[PDB]
Structure formats: C-alpha cells, structure tokens
UniProtKB/Swiss-Prot annotation, chain A:
GO terms for cellular component: cytosolic large ribosomal subunit. It comes from Deinococcus radiodurans (strain ATCC 13939 / DSM 20539 / JCM 16871 / CCUG 27074 / LMG 4051 / NBRC 15346 / NCIMB 9279 / VKM B-1422 / R1). GO terms for biological process: cytoplasmic translation. Keywords: Ribonucleoprotein, Ribosomal protein, RNA-binding, rRNA-binding. Pfam families: Ribosomal_L6. The lineage of its organism: Bacteria, Thermotogati, Deinococcota, Deinococci, Deinococcales. The keyword RNA-binding applies. One of its GO terms (molecular function) is structural constituent of ribosome. It is located near the subunit interface in the base of the L7/L12 stalk, and near the tRNA binding site of the peptidyltransferase center. This protein binds to the 23S rRNA, and is important in its secondary structure. Belongs to the universal ribosomal protein uL6 family. This is Large ribosomal subunit protein uL6. The gene is rplF.
Curated annotation (Swiss-Prot), chain B:
The keyword Ribosomal protein applies. This is Large ribosomal subunit protein bL21. Keywords: Ribonucleoprotein, Ribosomal protein, RNA-binding, rRNA-binding. GO terms for molecular function: rRNA binding; structural constituent of ribosome. PANTHER family: 50S RIBOSOMAL PROTEIN L21, LARGE RIBOSOMAL SUBUNIT PROTEIN BL21M.
Swiss-Prot record, chain D:
The gene is rplC. The keyword RNA-binding applies. HAMAP family: Ribosomal_uL3_B (MF_01325_B). Belongs to the universal ribosomal protein uL3 family. GO terms for molecular function: rRNA binding; structural constituent of ribosome. Keywords: Ribonucleoprotein, Ribosomal protein, RNA-binding, rRNA-binding. It comes from the Bacteria. It holds the Pfam family Ribosomal_L3. Part of the 50S ribosomal subunit. Forms a cluster with proteins L14 and L19. Also contacts proteins L13 and L17. This is Large ribosomal subunit protein uL3. GO terms for biological process: translation. Residues 125-148 are annotated as: Disordered.
UniProtKB/Swiss-Prot annotation, chain E:
This is Large ribosomal subunit protein bL20. Part of the 50S ribosomal subunit. Contacts proteins L13 and L21. Belongs to the bacterial ribosomal protein bL20 family. Disulfide bonds: none annotated. Binds directly to 23S rRNA, probably serving to organize its structure.
Amino acid sequence: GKQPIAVPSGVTVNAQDGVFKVKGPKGELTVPYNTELTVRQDGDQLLVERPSDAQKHRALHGLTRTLVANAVKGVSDGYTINLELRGVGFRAKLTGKALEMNIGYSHPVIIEPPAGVTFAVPEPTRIDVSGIDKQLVGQVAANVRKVRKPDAYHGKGVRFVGEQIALKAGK
Amino acid sequence: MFAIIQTGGKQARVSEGDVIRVESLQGEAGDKVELKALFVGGEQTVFGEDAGKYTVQAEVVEHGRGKKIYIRKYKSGVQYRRRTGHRQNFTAIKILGI
Amino acid sequence: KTYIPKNDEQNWVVVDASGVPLGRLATLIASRIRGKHRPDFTPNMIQGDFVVVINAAQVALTGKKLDDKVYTRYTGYQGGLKTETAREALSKHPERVIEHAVFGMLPKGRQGRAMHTRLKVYAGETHPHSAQKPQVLKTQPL
Amino acid sequence: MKGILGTKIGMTQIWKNDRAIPVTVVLAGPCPIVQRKTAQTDGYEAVQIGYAPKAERKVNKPMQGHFAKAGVAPTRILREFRGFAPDGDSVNVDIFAEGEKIDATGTSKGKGTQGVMKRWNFAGGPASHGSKKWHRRPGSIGQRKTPGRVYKGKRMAGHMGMERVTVQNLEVVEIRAGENLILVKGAIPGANGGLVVLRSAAKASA
Amino acid sequence: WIQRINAGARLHGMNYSTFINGLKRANIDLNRKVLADIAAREPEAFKALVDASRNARQ
RNA sequence: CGAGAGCUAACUUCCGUAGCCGAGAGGGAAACAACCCAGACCAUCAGCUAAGGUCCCUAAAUGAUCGCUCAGUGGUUAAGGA
RNA sequence: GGAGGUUUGGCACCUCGAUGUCGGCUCGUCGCAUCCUGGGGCUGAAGAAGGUCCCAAGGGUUGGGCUGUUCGCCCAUUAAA
RNA sequence: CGGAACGGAUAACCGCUGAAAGCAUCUAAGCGGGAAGCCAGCCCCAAGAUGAGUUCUCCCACUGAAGGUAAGACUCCCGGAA
Ligand SMILES: [Mg+2]
Ligand SMILES: [Mg+2]
Ligand SMILES: [Mg+2]
Ligand SMILES: [Mg+2]
Ligand SMILES: [Mg+2]
Ligand SMILES: [Mg+2]
Ligand SMILES: [Mg+2]
Ligand SMILES: [Mg+2]
Ligand SMILES: [Mg+2]
Ligand SMILES: [Mg+2]
Ligand SMILES: [Mg+2]
Ligand SMILES: [Mg+2]
Ligand SMILES: [Mg+2]
Ligand SMILES: [Mg+2]
Ligand SMILES: [Mg+2]
Ligand SMILES: [Mg+2]
Ligand SMILES: [Mg+2]
Ligand SMILES: [Mg+2]
Ligand SMILES: [Mg+2]
Ligand SMILES: [Mg+2]
Ligand SMILES: [Mg+2]
Ligand SMILES: [Mg+2]
Ligand SMILES: [Mg+2]
Ligand SMILES: [Mg+2]
Ligand SMILES: [Mg+2]
Ligand SMILES: [Mg+2]
Ligand SMILES: [Mg+2]
Ligand SMILES: [Mg+2]
Ligand SMILES: [Mg+2]
Ligand SMILES: [Mg+2]
Ligand SMILES: [Mg+2]
Ligand SMILES: [Mg+2]
C-alpha cells in the first residue's frame, strides 16, 4: 500500500465525484478516477482512502494514488526523459519543433510531437523530451525508441540515456 | 353483462334469456332462485359474501336438445376409425330476479 | 360468449432508450406492440400502441457486449457467410440494432411481420412524430 | 469528380514522337448546365448537364419546362456528375489537359445470349474423343445430394452484353480545342457512336 | 382469459399471480376467470376487486 | 440395473431383470416409438394439480433472502498447467 | 492424455418393385492441421539462405514422359508446385 | 486498362502510464503501435429497400363506380453496332 503525499505551493486541486481538476505552472492536467474511491484532501496535504479491503477494491487505491502522484508532481516540477542513439551514423536534429532522425535507413525518419511534449536535441546524438503528462512523454519516448530498438548483437539504436544492454555473441 | 358460470348454474348481474345444462325440474315450474357471486345493480358493484346476501329468481322456459355433433376419431395405419352421435340436453331459462 | 372489440384505438408513445440496457427496453417495446398492456383483447388483431424510440444511439449493452457480440446475416451467396458486423460499429446505424431485438421477439407470422411497422426507432434526441403527439412512458417497469 | 459526356467516334493510328499508338476519338461537345443540385436543396451535391440537342418539336412539355427553368435548349441526354461544380457550360477543353489520366465509361457492346465458352471463358470438352457435348456445354453443374443447391451466382449461358463498363487510367493523348474532339490512349467500350463519359481518375495513384 | 386478467391487474399495479392469490386469500371469490374478464371490460368493478384482493395479502 | 462377447467401442451382438414402444392418444424434453409427467366413454367459452415452468417470442413472480462466477462461463471433453 | 473423422475396419440402421460403380474430362465451392504470399516470437538468428513455433483462408499453386490408374517415379520449371 | 494507395477497427506480437505485494509487470481501470485478413475505399446491380425514398417539370379540376378527355403512353409502319 501507499498513501502519504506532498502537494507543494504553486498548485491547486479541485474535486468532483472522484475525477479532480488540477492546475499550476502547467494546468489542465485532469485525470479520471473511480467514484468507488474517496477523492479527498485535508488542505495542506491530500489522501486517497480505500472504503473497503476487497481485492479488486484494493488495486484501484494504488493505481489512483500513483496516478495522482505523477499528475500533480508533473505540474509541480515536470518530466524530462533523455536518450542516446548509438551506431555508425544515426544523426538527429530539430526542424522547428519536429525531430528528424537520420538513423540507419534509406530515408530520414521524422517524428511530430503530440501537443504538450517538447523535443530537444542538446547534442547531435542526444534526444530529450520534456512535458507534464508522464504517460504521454513515455509514449513519445517509446515512439522514438521503436524506430530502431537495439539489436541483440551490437546494440545499434535508441537507448535510454544511462542504459546498458545485453549482447549476444554471433560470428 | 353477466353470465352463468357453467359448472352448474350460479352467475352475476344479468337480465336475459339464456340456455344452460339440464335442470331436473321440468316444465316452467322451477322458478329457480340462484345465489350469484357478483352484481352491478345501480352501477353499485357488490361481490363476495355480500353476494351470498342477494339472490336472483328466474323461471325455467324450456327443456331442449342442442345442435348435433359427431364424435369422430382416427389413428394412422391401424385401420381404426370411430364415429358416434351426440347432442347435449339443456333447460333454457329467462331471468327476472333481484 | 366472450367480449371482443373493434380496433378503433390508435395510440402513440415515446419510449426512451438512453442509459437503458438493450433487451430490457426491447422486451418492453415488444410487449407494448404485441398488446399485453391493454386487456390483450384478441390474438386475432394488433391492438398495440405505436412506439417511437429516441436517443437509441445512447443504448447500453451491459457486459463486454459492445465488442465480441456478433451480428451474423446470410447473403445467400457462399462466402456471403456470417457477414459479421457484431459490435458498436453497428452503431454506425444504431437504430436497426434495437429493431433487431424487438423483431427477435415479435411473432414470425403474417401478423408478426405486420406489427413491426409500428416500431419507430430514432437514434437522435428528436423525432418527426409531433403530429401524432406521442405519450411518454417510463423505462422502469413495475 | 470533373467529367463530361460525348460520343465515341472511331479508332485510329497516331504518332506521338515516333511511338505509334492506338487512340480513340471521343467527341465531347459542349454541355449545358441544366440543374445545379445542392444538398441544401437536394440532399447531395452534384450537377446535371446535357448532350446532343433534340428538336424542340420532339420534346415533351415537361421536359421543355425542365430545360426552360435553366435557359437551355432541349438535349436528348442529361447526366449528373457528383462533386462537380463548374460555371457557365461544360466545354471539354477546360476540363482536360494533355496527358492526364481519365476514366472512360460507356456501355459494352451487346453480344446477346452467349454460351459459357464465350461468356465465362469456360473450357469446352473434347471435340472428337467420344462425346455429344462436342463443344459448348457447361458439363456438371453441382455436387450431388448434399447441398441439392446449384450455387446462387453460378455461371451459365446468358445475356453477355450491354453492361455499363468503366475503364481506368486512360491517357489524354491530345486535345483539339475548337472541334470539341478528344483523343484518348487505347480503347473505350461501346459500339461506335454510343454515349460515353470522360472523368478524372477514380483512384489518383502516385 | 388469464392473459386478459393480468392486463388489468398490472394496469392497477398488481399482477395475475398476486391478484388471483388475493382473490383467493379472501375465501368468498369463487368466480371463473371468464367472469373476471368480463369485469376487466368493466373497469370500476375490476378495480373494486383489485382493492379487495390487495386488502387480503396484507 | 447385472453379467458375457467387443476395444469397459457402437442407434453392435447374446442372456437376466424392471419399465415403456410394439398395440398408446395428452403435457413436458425447440424438434423426437423408447426418456420425465400421465392410460383419451361422450359434451362444456368451468376448477385443482403432475412432470415441466413464470424477461419477449409464449401461459404464469423483471418473486423474495444470503452468497458464487465478469468467463457469454451458462450454451461441447481430458492429462496437464495458472 | 485428447482431437478429427479423410484409411483398412466393425456393426447391419434407410435403400435389392434398383441409391450406376473405379480413373479421366467439365464445372466448381468449403475447412485449415498453411505449399507460396503477408504480420510476428525464439533461434545453435553476424550477413544472406534457414530452422521452428504463433496470427493469417484474399488470392495463387506449372507443362510433359510411364501406366486405366489413383497414387508414385522421372523430365524441365517454379513465389509455390 | 486492371489488382493498388490513403483510412478505420483488429489477430499473433510489440509497448506507454500502473496497482493489488512500499519491487517488478503491455492489464487488473485506462492508452498507443501492428497483417495479403475485417470494415471503408475501385468497378457493376439495386427503392418489389410493399421500410416502396428524393428532385425538376407538365395537365388540371370535366360530365353524367362509370364516360368524352388533358398532360402522355400505346397499337401499327420503317429500321437499329438492341
Ligand atoms: Mg403400428
Ligand atoms: Mg476446346
Ligand atoms: Mg447425377
Ligand atoms: Mg447437410
Ligand atoms: Mg436443401
Ligand atoms: Mg472385452
Ligand atoms: Mg441393438
Ligand atoms: Mg440385430
Ligand atoms: Mg408388430
Ligand atoms: Mg402398453
Ligand atoms: Mg406419450
Ligand atoms: Mg430435445
Ligand atoms: Mg412441442
Ligand atoms: Mg415413428
Ligand atoms: Mg405412436
Ligand atoms: Mg429412438
Ligand atoms: Mg421428473
Ligand atoms: Mg393451476
Ligand atoms: Mg410444481
Ligand atoms: Mg406472458
Ligand atoms: Mg481437470
Ligand atoms: Mg422406387
Ligand atoms: Mg429410379
Ligand atoms: Mg490457423
Ligand atoms: Mg514468412
Ligand atoms: Mg538472414
Ligand atoms: Mg484453397
Ligand atoms: Mg493500408
Ligand atoms: Mg492488446
Ligand atoms: Mg491504429
Ligand atoms: Mg495487393
Ligand atoms: Mg375513371
């Protein structure tokens, strides 16, 4: 189980039938939640209490609590994922807001951000993604990573910036 | 409006001339005073053991044999066909009770 | 001996469908069409009310049914097999779904065809039949 | 989308550069804009236009009045082109430019009641090795008792002819502007002098 | 007969099973269903029997 | 139900035994000699029930109370796995 | 331990007042336990060519010599026979 | 000349956020990606879609179910890559 919280100073939390609204430095980060749970807060700090200890009842508590944790902490401080391309060539660049990968294929491979997500290419072989909705930053980083998921032999491709990987042997 | 309940006689708030099953009182003599379980006299409905309070007379009008019917029966591939005559006796009566 | 009447009545009613399960609403409409609500004065004649469903596209299927429910219908042709439209993509033309229920329970005879006439589905919140002045009737039964 | 009517005239030889090619000459003469159908007044968007004038003596009164709404001479054929919204009258030049692909739709040549060897490319059966279905005959026609059926759809002797046929990606070879002629690469269906219609490619492939 | 009786039964907010159980629960109602039908064709008396029956399952 | 023969196959074949069918109508089992109910003297626009049922087709509680399964399981098996 | 009913059967239920039988030819249509093609997982998968399993029935699946043959063998090709 | 592209929802599969177990997990709520296959897209039929659809236009309101008639079909003649 998990329950303790930390709402900071520059944010505000509404409440309505379980489904709250939130604003702050970047507002309109609403999330769905179930009515069967108790959407609540004291004031200086929040909580989600579980009315009943049932199994399916218990799962929703931890789901909803991490979801409020990410959704509020993202408007309070934000999320930023970093990655590196590896392999011969494998360029990346920024055209306006779009990210031009130039990575091991006959064509350039472009990605156009969904709204709220900001690409950044601090180094020619360094991708970075910035945003609030952690779910969407994760799907965006995944959409870039899938373009060349690492091979089992030499590790060409997208990698999380600190990432290690196994290498099969071969000839 | 109301009708005999076939099982023997016995009925509700009528005024007419109806057939029914045979009465074992012959002639127009019977003057049968039957019990009735319901009545809408005065549009005032009355039923139940209230209707064991009220009773209606009705003269016997005529003994009679109804329209003929055959009783035919069949079964396949067994030869067996059956045929018989039948007419149901009755005693028509006209109503004039309370 | 038994009273029978003339078909003199012609009655119009607006069933709602929004939030209602399908089937639950469908049997209510099938009962109103087939005439059980009034003293079902004859088998012989169709004395049921005319039934004008609205907001049918807000119909509810209470299970997983919105997927995985199937709608087989044979075009005579081989390979015209189970031409399965099944789901909520049949809510591309929502009204027939509801029809298909009540006609699943309306009689299959000459008369049973002919009563389907009086079923007037309307997936939107609006219907033309203001000239009939249909009467409201609640989706809860008791 | 854009289209016009005309009449197949005949076929010929042609030389674009040095490559000899078979063209077909349609005459796509001017078409009046009779009726401007809009969805706000007709439920769907389209335009109906005419071809080959009819002597006014031959018109019904209702058709003289149909045209008479539009200030247009009676024309023996009217047709509707979906999504098409021109202005004035539909001359063929303006609609087409040389080399563009255009679908060509006309009515196939009625060959009447045709056997199966002719209609569906049936095989035939030996013409000497025993028979008395020497040619022509469809042979067997089903399974046996299970499905007693013969399939709905089954191919059989019949009216091979007269179908509407569309033919895709024909190439405008040339455009004679002041004659209202239009060359098209290769063949179009019909007897000569039948109506046909030329249109933009139904699938604009890359 | 039965099919016509439960129609008025439900018309009043009872039903055939409960309504004949209430017309039986008072001993004095012994009329045939056909006569309950004819009463279903006379609404006032039918409602009188409905209130009679319903005052017997209480 | 109890055996043999068979492969502890068969709407298989051969015996014992009970019941039905043959010779059996009527309600149930969608349909259906064998199963479950129940043995048709005749007539009725009368009543209680059997089996079986009570959402609509389709007669009759969208009955009541504590649960169980979210699989359409219900509405086609097992060794084995979770 | 199951599955399917395509084999050789068993059984003897409708058909001996007739249910034409093997092979070919002609038309076909269906299953999928998938020969090709499409999407995958693992691979003792470097690449290429593969193996094997999963999802997939839209379409497609060659012509000849031998024999009545089905089949099988062979010629010569195939995305595949 | 054609099979096709673009689209949508999908199978195996691949993932995002993520609990029930303060880890981890593509799923238990939720979301995204993925086939010659499913729906749409191409060509043809089709309102006997008795649920009979729309639009444009024409003849009008005659005399005693009938009858002369309008608008307008047909019969027949001559022919037709029908
Ligand atoms: Mg016998
Ligand atoms: Mg030949
Ligand atoms: Mg034959
Ligand atoms: Mg069969
Ligand atoms: Mg058949
Ligand atoms: Mg043995
Ligand atoms: Mg035997
Ligand atoms: Mg025997
Ligand atoms: Mg015998
Ligand atoms: Mg016996
Ligand atoms: Mg029996
Ligand atoms: Mg059965
Ligand atoms: Mg039966
Ligand atoms: Mg028999
Ligand atoms: Mg018998
Ligand atoms: Mg039997
Ligand atoms: Mg029993
Ligand atoms: Mg009873
Ligand atoms: Mg019982
Ligand atoms: Mg009922
Ligand atoms: Mg087990
Ligand atoms: Mg014979
Ligand atoms: Mg014969
Ligand atoms: Mg498969
Ligand atoms: Mg492959
Ligand atoms: Mg390789
Ligand atoms: Mg095949
Ligand atoms: Mg595509
Ligand atoms: Mg999934
Ligand atoms: Mg998608
Ligand atoms: Mg293709
Ligand atoms: Mg007339």
